Design a protein around this ligand. Structure first.
Ligand code: ZN
Ligand code: ZN
Ligand code: ZN
Ligand code: ZN
Ligand code: ZN
Ligand code: ZN
Lengths: 441, 441
């Protein structure tokens, strides 16, 4: 626990520590192998986003019981490459970053599972599976989106969702041109044991070539032995997931719905609008599983493999609501993630051989600023759990989408080999940390 | 060393790690006493600021040999308190934040060494000196400015530089009303062995009461046994500093000039103005010591003391140039600090009983964004060491001054007790960390 000790107005009352950490920390260090790994990604979840969520939901002196509880921490850099020059491109997108931690190679913005030369490289999930480990890939995004796609698809543009877009935009990748296929087709080939998220829509396309031609990708999935679920009760009734019967959960047509609703930040909104309180999203049907519920089932199913498992969990819409300049949506998706993280830590603490990592793909726009701020972008005032006003500012785009930022950001870990996130590292080190911790080749 | 391995375009070439860190970090873990501490603060130096500076000066895959080299890292919270309510104020100023790590108690914005009830609390410097340790206080700001002033002064507003402003803004601290006096008067009473910075201007005022009434604060210093220096050569030639002959250096009227010149960011500056390369500041005379040089003399003089020393070093103008939306200024001052950090680490590695800590008082405005960004605030394109463009954005104030932000930010450390900065901590923990490390009371 790292909440404030007591009365934050008094001496020592805002302390998060109760005693010397040296012994505890020594004891947090083990370089025995990891049997399992859970990687949780908050898309766009930089320190700022963590801090704003913490402040709103738990109070400034509060503590995220998942997010904030990983004891080994550092900062890592997630710059991409300029595709022509090979030089750094200081602000990555989700595809280049996800490619870095999943393959160990930098690449250009938009690219999945390929380097700047457009050459494929195998992913941590593929190398898990090859070693006979169970594999999970979970996200609140449409499953074609960069973050989950990067683990199972090798394509020259992240827009290559299915056959249609792939033919037009990744001709080199398209099945009918002899390539590996669209992101959705490659996802079906990769056959992780557990794949849960949104993105049903693209499954309605029919393949233009290959063994399942003329059939929707949904049909292909059924033809190939996959159990399809599409809501929380059907997911919960699944009793196994393996190579003979892999699980594919499709819980929405595009992105899964956000947990909280609030208004969009506006010009001078912290000055001209009253403070806001977020509310649970009245549009999110109770029958859509949450990210922690997706995470439960995935852990439950994968932990059955005696050899071990690799699991990626993405809180995808932190980023998407940060783009939308929607503090409540943004914060709620961070709360959402913290719940999934608690699940992971609770399994990992009891199992004892599980390395859990929590970070983001890149930083974002949202800034916490003073209540009287007069800023040129979009702002909004929030009433926090402390009963004070926090203002959030989105000040880096005049267009309709607040943009990523280049700042290094937090990475934290618990479990075997967690030492390797500490100090300054690069996103590509995380690939090798994962590879090594599981003893893969 | 945590530079990129090799060819950042190739598998594994952006890695910062050369192998498994578990055993190295184990060996970084000592709970034996610290004999000395050196605390370096980059004012306004958030993770974004570090990143921008590294990107520019060392390249994206580069490594600050000082700043980036401390092996035990975490993230800390620095929210202040509303004076009336006692609730968190999510964006601190430099006075509340420096009060927190220097006394271990939160306070309101603009307060120095006092809590929200205006009650004094002892500082780590005062406590060091009482235990017989040598003490230094160094900064590129005027020495009355919040960050250095917090170690030696107790006032209700940070604006109470000398007798003149203290009588009218901090009437309860004014000497003529029976208070402890202005920041400058209290600074002189506290009598650190070594005190170096700017702020000569205020020493020209005359005291309104007390033993040295009717004399200038400069004459008071002389009369009280202090050796006064005003430039690098005179500073170089000092051979001792102690309670009989304490050292006070005053190297500028107000703030010391910055190291680098470049133009101010402007609206659409990344688009309408060409890329900038920073150059050295023609206004900074060579006779002005640098922060590293100040740090050198300080370390050398203070290390005479057999029992130990406490030293704080502030790269103060990272913040001020962030305020002024001036990337070359901001970056130059971060490079300046990295040098002073190198001095400190070199000294700690050789002496081996010294805890060194590098952090910031709070986060700031500057954001690294994409080259074609169209932002509503102030931007600028810069040519980095990698021969690529980085754009920087200042997007949270339509006034002449860009504003602090509340994100938690990096704290890093090296030496005995440095475990206590790892994970999530509060800025007030840092006080207690320092205190227990030095066995103080
Ligand atoms: Zn992203
Ligand atoms: Zn994503
Ligand atoms: Zn995004
Ligand atoms: Zn400051
Ligand atoms: Zn300062
Ligand atoms: Zn400031």
């Amino acid at each position: 626990n790292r909440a404030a000790q007591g009365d934050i107005t008094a001496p020592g009352g805002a302390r998060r520590l109760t005693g010397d950490q040296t012994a505890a920390l020594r004891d947090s260090l083990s370089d025995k192998p990891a049997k399992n790994i859970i990687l949780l990604i908050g898309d766009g979840m930089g320190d700022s986003e963590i801090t704003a969520a913490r402040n709103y939901a738990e109070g400034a002196g509060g503590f995220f019981k998942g997010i904030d509880a990983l004891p080994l921490t550092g900062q890592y850099t997630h710059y991409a490459l300029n595709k022509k020059t090979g030089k750094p491109d200081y602000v990555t997108d989700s595809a280049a970053s996800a490619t870095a931690w999943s393959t160990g190679v930098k690449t250009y913005n938009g690219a999945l599972g390929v380097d700047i030369h457009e050459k494929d490289h195998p992913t941590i999930l593929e190398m898990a599976k090859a070693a006979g480990l169970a594999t999970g890939n979970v996200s609140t995004a449409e499953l074609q989106d960069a973050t989950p796609a990067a683990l199972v698809a090798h394509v020259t543009s992240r827009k290559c969702y299915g056959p249609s877009a792939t033919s037009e935009k990744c001709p080199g990748n398209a099945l009918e041109k002899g390539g590996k296929g669209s992101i959705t087709e490659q996802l079906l080939n990769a056959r992780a044991d557990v794949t849960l998220g949104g993105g049903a829509k693209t499954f309605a396309e029919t393949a233009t070539a290959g063994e399942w031609q003329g059939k929707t990708l949904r049909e292909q999935a059924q033809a190939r032995g996959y159990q399809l679920v599409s809501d929380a009760a059907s997911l919960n009734s699944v009793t196994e997931a393996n190579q003979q019967k892999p699980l594919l959960g499709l819980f929405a047509d595009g992105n899964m719905p956000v947990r909280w609703l609030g208004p969009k930040a506006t010009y001078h909104g912290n000055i001209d609008k009253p403070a806001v309180t977020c509310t649970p999203n009245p549009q999110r049907n109770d029958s859509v599983p949450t990210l922690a519920q997706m995470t439960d089932k995935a852990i439950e199913l994968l932990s059955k493999n005696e050899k071990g498992f690799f699991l990626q969990v993405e809180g995808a819409s932190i980023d998407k609501q940060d783009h939308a300049a929607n503090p409540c949506g943004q914060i709620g998706e961070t709360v959402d993630l913290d719940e999934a993280v608690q699940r992971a830590l609770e399994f990992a603490k009891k199992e004892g051989n599980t390395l859990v990592i929590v970070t983001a793909d890149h930083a974002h726009a949202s800034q916490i600023v003073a209540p009287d701020t007069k800023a040129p972008g979009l702002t909004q005032a929030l009433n926090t759990k402390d009963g004070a006003v926090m203002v959030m500012s989105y000040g880096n785009s005049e267009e309709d989408s607040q943009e990523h930022t280049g700042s290094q950001l937090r990475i934290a870990a618990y479990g075997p080999h967690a030492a390797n996130v500490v100090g300054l590292t690069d996103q590509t080190d995380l690939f090798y940390t994962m590879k090594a911790a599981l003893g893969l080749k």
